[PDB]
């Protein structure tokens, strides 16, 4: 109830899920854009 007294539960859940998905997608894209951590091309270390 500490933080759910104010914020709507459904809105908080939807916003958190969307933000987490967008952040994960951005981090994965950034990793794919690097030579070392691109697991698809798999260049040498």
């Amino acid at each position: 109830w500490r933080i759910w007294q104010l914020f709507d539960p459904r809105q908080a859940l939807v916003g958190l899920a969307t933000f987490l998905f967008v952040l994960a997608l951005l981090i994965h894209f950034i990793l794919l854009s690097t030579e070392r951590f691109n697991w698809l091309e798999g260049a040498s270390t």
């Binding site: 916003g15 950034i30 794919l32 854009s33 690097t34």
Partner: protein, 259 residues
Amino acid sequence: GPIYLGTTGVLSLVFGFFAIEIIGFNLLASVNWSPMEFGRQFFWLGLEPPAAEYGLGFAPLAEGGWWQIAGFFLTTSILLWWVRMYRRARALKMGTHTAWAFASAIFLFLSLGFIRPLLMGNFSESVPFGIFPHLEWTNSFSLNYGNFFYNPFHMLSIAFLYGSALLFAMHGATILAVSRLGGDREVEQITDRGTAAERAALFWRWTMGFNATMESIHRWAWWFAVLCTFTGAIGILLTGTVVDNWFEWGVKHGLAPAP
């Protein structure tokens, strides 16, 4: 005035403000912080995208990194504004037609800025931030990829832009003509058909053989406006990725005689 921002509006404004500040600071630094030179060359100033050798990664700040940061922040701001105009329509218990029409412009913006560079592997041919720089990007894009006049989806985008202008010149003129009969109360006419809507439909029927309704003319307008940017985005995506020379494509497909 009574602008409702909310959480999504605050986010979008912060992101867009950061992007605008980055772009403006880069433009002012390009003239060595001269207000006089900034005023002199404001149109010619631009923030260019990174070169092709950097790929989709983070280029150095002085070599396109600022462009990448500003572009990402602007894209996030625009997407959050789309979310805002979706949520405002939902809150007012109204339809999301405005959000889904803005989605087409966002699609074109992403195709020009992010999606096509993602397909091509680098940000070299992305649109720089500047009036004359982006005009020159337009010119050089068309010149490099054959002739954009010969792009069929560019043809369609131009046709739908002319159609949007034509449809608004028809609709505004018609509503002003029937404004003395209560035609400006369009939703009231939709809910209870009146002599204004009847006379507008009859005028267009007697003119060109067929007519619309007070709601379906707005459907026509919405679809024309959306299809302009949608077909244009499709043409931008297909340019270079699958067709390297639009003039040669037109020659192959009979649009022009073979040189």
